[PDB]
PDB file of C-alpha atoms and ligand atoms in Angstrom:
ATOM      1  CA  UNK H 704       1.119 -19.366 -16.275  1.00 25.50           C
ATOM      2  CA  UNK H 705      -0.075 -16.299 -14.317  1.00 22.66           C
ATOM      3  CA  UNK H 706      -3.606 -14.937 -14.737  1.00 19.19           C
ATOM      4  CA  UNK H 707      -2.887 -11.229 -14.784  1.00 20.38           C
ATOM      5  CA  UNK H 708      -5.585  -9.660 -12.666  1.00 19.76           C
ATOM      6  CA  UNK H 709      -6.222  -6.097 -13.858  1.00 17.69           C
ATOM      7  CA  UNK H 710      -7.548  -3.823 -11.097  1.00 16.77           C
ATOM      8  CA  UNK H 711      -9.416  -0.639 -12.048  1.00 17.15           C
ATOM      9  CA  UNK H 712      -8.280   2.203  -9.774  1.00 16.44           C
ATOM     10  CA  UNK H 713     -10.083   5.406  -8.929  1.00 14.74           C
ATOM     11  CA  UNK H 714      -7.892   8.098  -7.352  1.00 11.72           C
ATOM     12  CA  UNK H 715      -9.811  10.533  -5.129  1.00 12.16           C
ATOM     13  CA  UNK H 716      -7.667  13.651  -4.768  1.00 14.80           C
ATOM     14  CA  UNK H 717      -8.977  15.628  -1.760  1.00 12.79           C
ATOM     15  CA  UNK H 718      -7.311  19.056  -1.641  1.00 11.30           C
ATOM     16  CA  UNK H 719      -7.441  22.150   0.580  1.00 14.36           C
ATOM     17  CA  UNK H 720      -4.564  24.254  -0.818  1.00 14.90           C
ATOM     18  CA  UNK H 721      -4.082  24.282  -4.607  1.00 17.72           C
ATOM     19  CA  UNK H 722      -0.697  22.526  -4.327  1.00 16.02           C
ATOM     20  CA  UNK H 723      -2.522  19.501  -2.874  1.00 17.88           C
ATOM     21  CA  UNK H 724      -4.515  19.062  -6.085  1.00 20.08           C
ATOM     22  CA  UNK H 725      -1.793  16.851  -7.465  1.00 21.00           C
ATOM     23  CA  UNK H 726      -0.929  16.606 -11.136  1.00 23.85           C
ATOM     24  CA  UNK H 727      -2.045  13.901 -13.536  1.00 21.51           C
ATOM     25  CA  UNK H 728       1.683  13.116 -14.011  1.00 24.88           C
ATOM     26  CA  UNK H 729       2.145  12.537 -10.279  1.00 24.29           C
ATOM     27  CA  UNK H 730      -0.889  10.198 -10.172  1.00 22.85           C
ATOM     28  CA  UNK H 731       0.202   8.334 -13.300  1.00 21.32           C
ATOM     29  CA  UNK H 732       3.693   7.933 -11.863  1.00 22.08           C
ATOM     30  CA  UNK H 733       2.196   6.044  -8.927  1.00 21.03           C
ATOM     31  CA  UNK H 734       0.200   3.746 -11.202  1.00 21.24           C
ATOM     32  CA  UNK H 735       3.410   3.043 -13.131  1.00 22.01           C
ATOM     33  CA  UNK H 736       5.185   2.055  -9.882  1.00 21.02           C
ATOM     34  CA  UNK H 737       2.363  -0.312  -8.909  1.00 21.56           C
ATOM     35  CA  UNK H 738       2.643  -1.963 -12.304  1.00 21.71           C
ATOM     36  CA  UNK H 739       6.377  -2.584 -11.703  1.00 25.56           C
ATOM     37  CA  UNK H 740       6.219  -3.692  -8.054  1.00 23.27           C
ATOM     38  CA  UNK H 741       3.250  -6.057  -8.493  1.00 24.75           C
ATOM     39  CA  UNK H 742       4.866  -7.676 -11.565  1.00 24.84           C
ATOM     40  CA  UNK H 743       8.457  -8.017 -10.254  1.00 21.99           C
ATOM     41  CA  UNK H 744       9.552  -5.499 -12.901  1.00 23.22           C
ATOM     42  CA  UNK H 745      11.112  -3.000 -10.461  1.00 22.57           C
ATOM     43  CA  UNK H 746      14.815  -2.695 -11.349  1.00 22.22           C
ATOM     44  CA  UNK H 747      15.749  -2.474  -7.666  1.00 20.88           C
ATOM     45  CA  UNK H 748      14.660  -6.099  -7.132  1.00 20.53           C
ATOM     46  CA  UNK H 749      18.438  -6.593  -7.707  1.00 22.09           C
ATOM     47  CA  UNK H 750      18.962  -5.347  -4.111  1.00 20.39           C
ATOM     48  CA  UNK H 751      17.429  -8.468  -2.553  1.00 23.34           C
ATOM     49  CA  UNK H 752      20.055 -10.564  -0.784  1.00 22.85           C
ATOM     50  CA  UNK H 753      20.893 -13.551  -3.046  1.00 21.98           C
ATOM     51  CA  UNK H 754      19.964 -16.031  -0.290  1.00 22.17           C
ATOM     52  CA  UNK H 755      16.340 -14.926  -0.835  1.00 23.08           C
ATOM     53  CA  UNK H 756      16.397 -14.468  -4.662  1.00 22.59           C
ATOM     54  CA  UNK H 757      14.429 -17.708  -5.011  1.00 23.93           C
ATOM     55  CA  UNK H 758      11.552 -16.301  -2.857  1.00 23.15           C
ATOM     56  CA  UNK H 759      10.943 -13.094  -4.832  1.00 22.48           C
ATOM     57  CA  UNK H 760       7.377 -13.089  -6.222  1.00 23.83           C
ATOM     58  CA  UNK H 761       5.582 -11.770  -9.283  1.00 22.50           C
ATOM     59  CA  UNK H 762       2.105 -11.134  -7.836  1.00 21.60           C
ATOM     60  CA  UNK H 763       0.602 -11.012 -11.329  1.00 24.70           C
ATOM     61  CA  UNK H 764      -1.485  -7.934 -10.651  1.00 19.56           C
ATOM     62  CA  UNK H 765      -1.697  -4.802 -12.792  1.00 21.33           C
ATOM     63  CA  UNK H 766      -3.523  -1.523 -12.241  1.00 20.44           C
ATOM     64  CA  UNK H 767      -5.104   1.074 -14.448  1.00 22.47           C
ATOM     65  CA  UNK H 768      -6.976   4.297 -13.896  1.00 24.44           C
ATOM     66  CA  UNK H 769     -10.640   3.357 -14.463  1.00 25.23           C
ATOM     67  CA  UNK H 770     -11.983   4.013 -17.942  1.00 25.58           C
ATOM     68  CA  UNK H 771     -15.648   3.543 -17.002  1.00 27.95           C
ATOM     69  CA  UNK H 772     -17.405   5.112 -14.043  1.00 28.53           C
ATOM     70  CA  UNK H 773     -19.693   3.083 -11.741  1.00 26.75           C
ATOM     71  CA  UNK H 774     -22.574   3.570 -14.172  1.00 23.51           C
ATOM     72  CA  UNK H 775     -20.576   2.633 -17.285  1.00 23.36           C
ATOM     73  CA  UNK H 776     -19.729   6.156 -18.525  1.00 23.17           C
ATOM     74  CA  UNK H 777     -16.348   7.456 -19.701  1.00 19.27           C
ATOM     75  CA  UNK H 778     -14.099   8.637 -16.908  1.00 19.16           C
ATOM     76  CA  UNK H 779     -10.476   9.670 -16.250  1.00 21.27           C
ATOM     77  CA  UNK H 780     -10.574   7.453 -13.133  1.00 19.38           C
ATOM     78  CA  UNK H 781      -9.609  10.533 -11.061  1.00 19.04           C
ATOM     79  CA  UNK H 782     -11.920  12.551  -8.849  1.00 17.59           C
ATOM     80  CA  UNK H 783     -10.831  15.937  -7.485  1.00 17.17           C
ATOM     81  CA  UNK H 784     -12.600  17.355  -4.461  1.00 17.73           C
ATOM     82  CA  UNK H 785     -11.902  20.672  -2.750  1.00 16.85           C
ATOM     83  CA  UNK H 786     -12.195  20.606   1.027  1.00 16.79           C
ATOM     84  CA  UNK H 787     -11.962  23.010   3.969  1.00 18.50           C
ATOM     85  CA  UNK H 788     -10.547  20.128   6.081  1.00 17.03           C
ATOM     86  CA  UNK H 789      -6.873  20.518   6.977  1.00 17.47           C
ATOM     87  CA  UNK H 790      -6.120  16.971   8.114  1.00 21.12           C
ATOM     88  CA  UNK H 791      -7.650  13.529   7.988  1.00 20.57           C
ATOM     89  CA  UNK H 792      -7.222  10.533  10.243  1.00 21.00           C
ATOM     90  CA  UNK H 793      -7.550   6.768  10.392  1.00 22.90           C
ATOM     91  CA  UNK H 794     -11.228   7.378  11.364  1.00 20.86           C
ATOM     92  CA  UNK H 795     -12.031   7.609   7.607  1.00 21.05           C
ATOM     93  CA  UNK H 796     -13.181  11.268   7.307  1.00 19.50           C
ATOM     94  CA  UNK H 797     -11.542  11.306   3.838  1.00 20.04           C
ATOM     95  CA  UNK H 798     -13.935   8.614   2.612  1.00 20.75           C
ATOM     96  CA  UNK H 799     -17.240  10.520   3.033  1.00 21.89           C
ATOM     97  CA  UNK H 800     -18.439  13.703   1.321  1.00 21.58           C
ATOM     98  CA  UNK H 801     -20.211  14.627   4.572  1.00 24.01           C
ATOM     99  CA  UNK H 802     -16.909  14.792   6.498  1.00 23.38           C
ATOM    100  CA  UNK H 803     -15.131  16.841   3.786  1.00 22.49           C
ATOM    101  CA  UNK H 804     -13.812  13.870   1.786  1.00 21.05           C
ATOM    102  CA  UNK H 805     -15.096  11.961  -1.228  1.00 24.28           C
ATOM    103  CA  UNK H 806     -17.407   8.922  -1.298  1.00 27.58           C
ATOM    104  CA  UNK H 807     -16.062   5.546  -2.366  1.00 24.62           C
ATOM    105  CA  UNK H 808     -16.852   4.008  -5.733  1.00 24.92           C
ATOM    106  CA  UNK H 809     -18.191   0.398  -5.525  1.00 23.43           C
ATOM    107  CA  UNK H 810     -15.466  -1.637  -3.822  1.00 19.95           C
ATOM    108  CA  UNK H 811     -16.346  -4.850  -5.660  1.00 18.42           C
ATOM    109  CA  UNK H 812     -15.251  -3.240  -8.927  1.00 17.57           C
ATOM    110  CA  UNK H 813     -12.678  -0.562  -8.074  1.00 15.87           C
ATOM    111  CA  UNK H 814      -9.668  -0.067  -5.850  1.00 13.68           C
ATOM    112  CA  UNK H 815     -10.370   3.272  -4.181  1.00 12.82           C
ATOM    113  CA  UNK H 816      -7.231   5.306  -3.481  1.00  9.34           C
ATOM    114  CA  UNK H 817      -7.711   8.596  -1.558  1.00 10.02           C
ATOM    115  CA  UNK H 818      -4.930  11.194  -1.592  1.00  9.13           C
ATOM    116  CA  UNK H 819      -4.873  13.990   0.993  1.00 10.21           C
ATOM    117  CA  UNK H 820      -2.228  16.315   2.422  1.00 12.01           C
ATOM    118  CA  UNK H 821      -2.081  15.340   6.129  1.00  8.84           C
ATOM    119  CA  UNK H 822      -2.949  12.041   7.865  1.00 11.49           C
ATOM    120  CA  UNK H 823      -2.826  11.366  11.549  1.00 11.92           C
ATOM    121  CA  UNK H 824      -3.207   8.180  13.545  1.00 12.29           C
ATOM    122  CA  UNK H 825      -5.606   7.939  16.491  1.00 12.12           C
ATOM    123  CA  UNK H 826      -2.758   8.958  18.843  1.00 11.46           C
ATOM    124  CA  UNK H 827      -1.867  11.959  16.624  1.00 14.20           C
ATOM    125  CA  UNK H 828       1.274  10.579  14.902  1.00 16.96           C
ATOM    126  CA  UNK H 829       1.747  11.877  11.425  1.00 18.89           C
ATOM    127  CA  UNK H 830       1.469   8.850   9.142  1.00 18.70           C
ATOM    128  CA  UNK H 831       1.987   8.269   5.411  1.00 20.11           C
ATOM    129  CA  UNK H 832      -0.974   6.037   4.637  1.00 23.65           C
ATOM    130  CA  UNK H 833      -3.428   3.442   5.829  1.00 24.43           C
ATOM    131  CA  UNK H 834      -5.431   0.569   4.413  1.00 22.65           C
ATOM    132  CA  UNK H 835      -8.586  -1.394   5.021  1.00 23.18           C
ATOM    133  CA  UNK H 836      -8.091  -5.147   4.976  1.00 25.65           C
ATOM    134  CA  UNK H 837     -10.511  -7.397   3.027  1.00 25.66           C
ATOM    135  CA  UNK H 838     -13.940  -8.142   4.487  1.00 25.30           C
ATOM    136  CA  UNK H 839     -14.700  -4.603   5.780  1.00 22.28           C
ATOM    137  CA  UNK H 840     -17.590  -2.420   4.669  1.00 27.29           C
ATOM    138  CA  UNK H 841     -17.541  -1.306   1.005  1.00 27.31           C
ATOM    139  CA  UNK H 842     -18.072   2.324   2.107  1.00 25.12           C
ATOM    140  CA  UNK H 843     -14.522   2.609   3.446  1.00 27.44           C
ATOM    141  CA  UNK H 844     -12.750  -0.044   1.359  1.00 26.07           C
ATOM    142  CA  UNK H 845      -9.453   1.004  -0.192  1.00 27.58           C
ATOM    143  CA  UNK H 846      -6.249   2.829   0.712  1.00 29.20           C
ATOM    144  CA  UNK H 847      -5.318   6.381   1.718  1.00 29.56           C
ATOM    145  CA  UNK H 848      -1.897   7.955   0.959  1.00 30.44           C
ATOM    146  CA  UNK H 849      -0.584  11.462   1.732  1.00 27.88           C
ATOM    147  CA  UNK H 850       0.328  13.426  -1.395  1.00 27.83           C
ATOM    148  CA  UNK H 851       3.991  13.881  -0.371  1.00 25.52           C
ATOM    149  CA  UNK H 852       4.314  10.063  -0.282  1.00 22.42           C
ATOM    150  CA  UNK H 853       2.377   9.441  -3.515  1.00 20.61           C
ATOM    151  CA  UNK H 854       4.018   8.975  -6.908  1.00 20.74           C
ATOM    152  CA  UNK H 855       7.544   9.810  -7.993  1.00 20.93           C
ATOM    153  CA  UNK H 856       7.281  13.443  -9.121  1.00 22.94           C
ATOM    154  CA  UNK H 857       5.288  16.591  -8.265  1.00 17.14           C
ATOM    155  CA  UNK H 858       4.881  16.919  -4.487  1.00 18.88           C
ATOM    156  CA  UNK H 859       6.498  13.568  -3.598  1.00 18.27           C
ATOM    157  CA  UNK H 860       9.477  13.971  -1.244  1.00 19.88           C
ATOM    158  CA  UNK H 861      12.319  11.680  -0.200  1.00 23.02           C
ATOM    159  CA  UNK H 862      12.642   9.252   1.393  1.00 19.65           C
ATOM    160  CA  UNK H 863       9.079   8.383   0.372  1.00 19.40           C
ATOM    161  CA  UNK H 864       9.293   9.409  -3.271  1.00 18.74           C
ATOM    162  CA  UNK H 865       9.503   5.996  -5.016  1.00 15.49           C
ATOM    163  CA  UNK H 866       5.816   5.082  -4.719  1.00 13.63           C
ATOM    164  CA  UNK H 867       6.255   2.406  -2.063  1.00 10.79           C
ATOM    165  CA  UNK H 868       3.721   3.712   0.472  1.00 11.92           C
ATOM    166  CA  UNK H 869       1.009   2.681  -2.010  1.00 15.01           C
ATOM    167  CA  UNK H 870       2.710  -0.695  -2.648  1.00 16.10           C
ATOM    168  CA  UNK H 871       2.775  -1.316   1.109  1.00 16.82           C
ATOM    169  CA  UNK H 872      -0.865  -0.214   1.674  1.00 17.43           C
ATOM    170  CA  UNK H 873      -2.184  -2.188  -1.322  1.00 17.43           C
ATOM    171  CA  UNK H 874      -0.311  -5.138   0.216  1.00 15.83           C
ATOM    172  CA  UNK H 875      -2.692  -4.783   3.222  1.00 17.44           C
ATOM    173  CA  UNK H 876      -5.641  -4.347   0.851  1.00 19.48           C
ATOM    174  CA  UNK H 877      -4.666  -7.812  -0.526  1.00 17.56           C
ATOM    175  CA  UNK H 878      -4.553  -9.331   3.009  1.00 15.66           C
ATOM    176  CA  UNK H 879      -0.811  -9.038   3.795  1.00 12.43           C
ATOM    177  CA  UNK H 880       0.243  -8.175   7.353  1.00  9.87           C
ATOM    178  CA  UNK H 881       3.302  -6.376   8.697  1.00 11.01           C
ATOM    179  CA  UNK H 882       6.224  -8.780   8.588  1.00  8.77           C
ATOM    180  CA  UNK H 883       7.099  -8.274  12.290  1.00 11.58           C
ATOM    181  CA  UNK H 884       3.669  -9.420  13.557  1.00  8.48           C
ATOM    182  CA  UNK H 885       2.274  -6.196  15.130  1.00 11.17           C
ATOM    183  CA  UNK H 886       2.953  -6.950  18.813  1.00 10.60           C
ATOM    184  CA  UNK H 887       1.549  -4.602  21.430  1.00 11.31           C
ATOM    185  CA  UNK H 888       4.118  -2.893  23.659  1.00 11.06           C
ATOM    186  CA  UNK H 889       3.693  -5.332  26.554  1.00 13.80           C
ATOM    187  CA  UNK H 890       3.948  -8.483  24.381  1.00 11.04           C
ATOM    188  CA  UNK H 891       7.034 -10.626  23.642  1.00 10.10           C
ATOM    189  CA  UNK H 892       8.502  -9.059  20.436  1.00 11.63           C
ATOM    190  CA  UNK H 893       8.997 -12.514  18.876  1.00 10.49           C
ATOM    191  CA  UNK H 894       5.506 -13.859  19.668  1.00 10.02           C
ATOM    192  CA  UNK H 895       3.324 -12.821  16.706  1.00  7.32           C
ATOM    193  CA  UNK H 896       3.255 -14.109  13.143  1.00  7.43           C
ATOM    194  CA  UNK H 897       2.423 -12.540   9.748  1.00  5.41           C
ATOM    195  CA  UNK H 898       1.062 -15.998   8.754  1.00  4.09           C
ATOM    196  CA  UNK H 899       3.714 -16.330   6.041  1.00  3.72           C
ATOM    197  CA  UNK H 900       6.249 -19.151   6.396  1.00  4.06           C
ATOM    198  CA  UNK H 901       8.843 -17.665   4.070  1.00  2.00           C
ATOM    199  CA  UNK H 902       9.098 -14.336   5.881  1.00  2.00           C
ATOM    200  CA  UNK H 903      11.520 -14.857   8.811  1.00  2.00           C
ATOM    201  CA  UNK H 904      10.153 -14.261  12.287  1.00  4.88           C
ATOM    202  CA  UNK H 905      10.990 -10.670  13.132  1.00  4.17           C
ATOM    203  CA  UNK H 906      10.956  -8.622  16.336  1.00  3.21           C
ATOM    204  CA  UNK H 907      10.050  -5.071  15.340  1.00  4.05           C
ATOM    205  CA  UNK H 908       9.564  -2.809  12.323  1.00  5.10           C
ATOM    206  CA  UNK H 909      12.682  -1.583  10.628  1.00  2.91           C
ATOM    207  CA  UNK H 910      12.977   2.065   9.589  1.00  2.00           C
ATOM    208  CA  UNK H 911      15.407   3.814   7.251  1.00  2.00           C
ATOM    209  CA  UNK H 912      17.557   1.211   5.553  1.00  2.00           C
ATOM    210  CA  UNK H 913      19.283  -1.405   7.725  1.00  2.00           C
ATOM    211  CA  UNK H 914      22.567  -3.018   6.745  1.00  2.00           C
ATOM    212  CA  UNK H 915      22.291  -6.691   5.786  1.00  3.48           C
ATOM    213  CA  UNK H 916      22.012  -8.775   7.907  1.00  4.82           C
ATOM    214  CA  UNK H 917      19.714  -7.284  10.549  1.00  6.90           C
ATOM    215  CA  UNK H 918      19.126 -10.171  12.917  1.00  7.39           C
ATOM    216  CA  UNK H 919      16.226 -10.433  15.419  1.00 10.76           C
ATOM    217  CA  UNK H 920      14.272 -13.239  17.152  1.00 15.31           C
ATOM    218  CA  UNK H 921      17.084 -15.783  16.590  1.00 13.38           C
ATOM    219  CA  UNK H 922      16.577 -15.553  12.826  1.00 10.92           C
ATOM    220  CA  UNK H 923      20.300 -15.472  12.116  1.00 10.91           C
ATOM    221  CA  UNK H 924      22.406 -15.706  10.158  1.00 12.04           C
ATOM    222  CA  UNK H 925      20.258 -14.185   7.407  1.00  8.58           C
ATOM    223  CA  UNK H 926      18.175 -11.931   9.681  1.00  9.90           C
ATOM    224  CA  UNK H 927      15.034  -9.842   9.002  1.00 12.10           C
ATOM    225  CA  UNK H 928      13.704  -9.592   5.448  1.00  9.49           C
ATOM    226  CA  UNK H 929      13.670  -5.814   5.953  1.00 11.38           C
ATOM    227  CA  UNK H 930      13.575  -5.193   2.171  1.00  9.82           C
ATOM    228  CA  UNK H 931      10.075  -6.686   2.043  1.00  9.27           C
ATOM    229  CA  UNK H 932       7.292  -4.184   1.208  1.00 11.71           C
ATOM    230  CA  UNK H 933       5.511  -5.142   4.458  1.00 13.60           C
ATOM    231  CA  UNK H 934       8.302  -3.753   6.670  1.00 15.36           C
ATOM    232  CA  UNK H 935       8.615   0.009   7.398  1.00 14.64           C
ATOM    233  CA  UNK H 936      11.892   0.806   5.627  1.00 13.69           C
ATOM    234  CA  UNK H 937      12.403   3.806   3.286  1.00 12.34           C
ATOM    235  CA  UNK H 938      11.007   3.498  -0.280  1.00 13.46           C
ATOM    236  CA  UNK H 939      14.382   2.787  -1.896  1.00 15.59           C
ATOM    237  CA  UNK H 940      15.060  -0.005   0.628  1.00 16.33           C
ATOM    238  CA  UNK H 941      11.908  -2.150   0.078  1.00 16.52           C
ATOM    239  CA  UNK H 942      11.848  -3.976  -3.227  1.00 14.51           C
ATOM    240  CA  UNK H 943      10.043  -7.340  -2.965  1.00 18.29           C
ATOM    241  CA  UNK H 944       7.114  -9.540  -2.059  1.00 19.55           C
ATOM    242  CA  UNK H 945       7.685 -13.218  -1.289  1.00 19.16           C
ATOM    243  CA  UNK H 946       6.052 -16.253  -2.848  1.00 17.55           C
ATOM    244  CA  UNK H 947       4.489 -17.031   0.562  1.00 20.50           C
ATOM    245  CA  UNK H 948       2.864 -13.598   0.468  1.00 21.05           C
ATOM    246  CA  UNK H 949       1.664 -14.330  -3.078  1.00 16.72           C
ATOM    247  CA  UNK H 950      -0.153 -17.372  -1.684  1.00 13.95           C
ATOM    248  CA  UNK H 951      -2.127 -15.086   0.693  1.00 16.88           C
ATOM    249  CA  UNK H 952      -2.766 -12.536  -2.064  1.00 16.66           C
ATOM    250  CA  UNK H 953      -4.029 -15.401  -4.252  1.00 17.07           C
ATOM    251  CA  UNK H 954      -6.400 -16.563  -1.532  1.00 19.18           C
ATOM    252  CA  UNK H 955      -7.674 -12.972  -1.251  1.00 16.15           C
ATOM    253  CA  UNK H 956      -8.318 -12.739  -5.008  1.00 13.50           C
ATOM    254  CA  UNK H 957     -10.000 -16.164  -5.062  1.00 11.76           C
ATOM    255  CA  UNK H 958     -12.245 -15.395  -2.089  1.00 10.19           C
ATOM    256  CA  UNK H 959     -13.218 -11.982  -0.686  1.00 14.45           C
ATOM    257  CA  UNK H 960     -11.991 -10.050  -3.768  1.00 14.91           C
ATOM    258  CA  UNK H 961     -13.058 -12.607  -6.388  1.00 15.97           C
ATOM    259  CA  UNK H 962     -15.309  -9.904  -7.915  1.00 15.85           C
ATOM    260  CA  UNK H 963     -12.120  -8.501  -9.555  1.00 12.96           C
ATOM    261  CA  UNK H 964     -11.463 -11.702 -11.489  1.00 14.30           C
ATOM    262  CA  UNK H 965     -12.251 -11.922 -15.196  1.00  9.27           C
TER     263      UNK H 965
HETATM  264  C1  LIG P1181       2.841   4.561  12.081  1.00 10.89           C
HETATM  265  C2  LIG P1181       4.270   4.488  11.507  1.00 10.89           C
HETATM  266  C3  LIG P1181       5.266   5.167  12.447  1.00 10.89           C
HETATM  267  C4  LIG P1181       4.313   5.085  10.062  1.00 10.89           C
HETATM  268  N1  LIG P1181       3.717   4.148   9.118  1.00 10.89           N
HETATM  269  C5  LIG P1181       2.927   4.500   8.110  1.00 10.89           C
HETATM  270  O1  LIG P1181       2.586   5.658   7.864  1.00 10.89           O
HETATM  271  C6  LIG P1181       2.436   3.349   7.252  1.00 10.89           C
HETATM  272  N2  LIG P1181       0.946   3.394   7.189  1.00 10.89           N
HETATM  273  C7  LIG P1181       3.046   3.436   5.846  1.00 10.89           C
HETATM  274  C8  LIG P1181       4.540   3.117   5.775  1.00 10.89           C
HETATM  275  C9  LIG P1181       5.093   3.498   4.399  1.00 10.89           C
HETATM  276  N3  LIG P1181       6.536   3.306   4.263  1.00 10.89           N
HETATM  277  C10 LIG P1181       7.208   3.540   3.137  1.00 10.89           C
HETATM  278  N4  LIG P1181       8.508   3.333   3.070  1.00 10.89           N
HETATM  279  N5  LIG P1181       6.572   3.976   2.062  1.00 10.89           N
HETATM  280  C11 LIG P1181       5.745   5.351   9.599  1.00 10.89           C
HETATM  281  O2  LIG P1181       6.324   4.519   8.902  1.00 10.89           O
HETATM  282  O3  LIG P1181       6.356   6.394   9.875  1.00 10.89           O
HETATM  283 CA1   CA P1182     -13.604   3.069   9.930  1.00 11.70          CA
HETATM  284 CA1   CA P1183       6.644 -14.943   8.805  1.00  9.17          CA
HETATM  285 CA1   CA P1184       7.538  -9.561  16.172  1.00  9.94          CA
HETATM  286 ZN1   ZN P1185       1.313  -1.127   7.067  1.00  8.86          ZN
END
């Protein structure tokens, strides 16, 4: 039997233009997606190649907008903060009031999700989101998602309008790594592991939505599990976690994030 671990979420909406101050419906829509994806209740789980049907996992995690604030008072679980900042980066400016963002709530008790309009990587690439893996400082613990890739209504835009950027980032929050192993440009593309036996060794990230099979690193005939949430495919194309990933998530919940357990 699964222990359903129920994670209180606080959504920090950080907005410059009014349109960035996203609706309650848009936020709720994202929560609803998390509650499908992390319970194997997403209808599109039917898209997984049958050869891997046996590996599809129910992570046994559910999410709710916090009902009590950090001091035990009634809350909506949503903060809304106006800013003069026009973009944020992986350097965590969104996570501090002093840099035009919003401070984290206590990371031992809440999953902090920040939503902002524009995110850039350190090299200036526009990106959709980023996470902090377990073990990092509480001050910056959580996930950040751009509003146009958050939820399934309002400002969300295809092909990132099915709530999967958050599923992917919360995957990292729960100690899951990119399925292809994150090689640096000069490294052998088949050399790094995601530390999960049941995810096939994979050369590079997949984008868009590959045709099955997409073989790499001699992983034929079945090929890359590109429909896994820890690849880089479009929202409608990623639809599953594996049981091997659930093992890692379970270790995370039992150890560094054990504070979330009942
Ligand atoms: C850095 C790459 C190019 C970039 N990745 C992200 O923004 C990543 N943090 C989230 C991927 C979300 N994918 C999805 N289907 N919801 C990118 O993919 O462009
Ligand atoms: Ca940092
Ligand atoms: Ca693997
Ligand atoms: Ca690889
Ligand atoms: Zn990622």
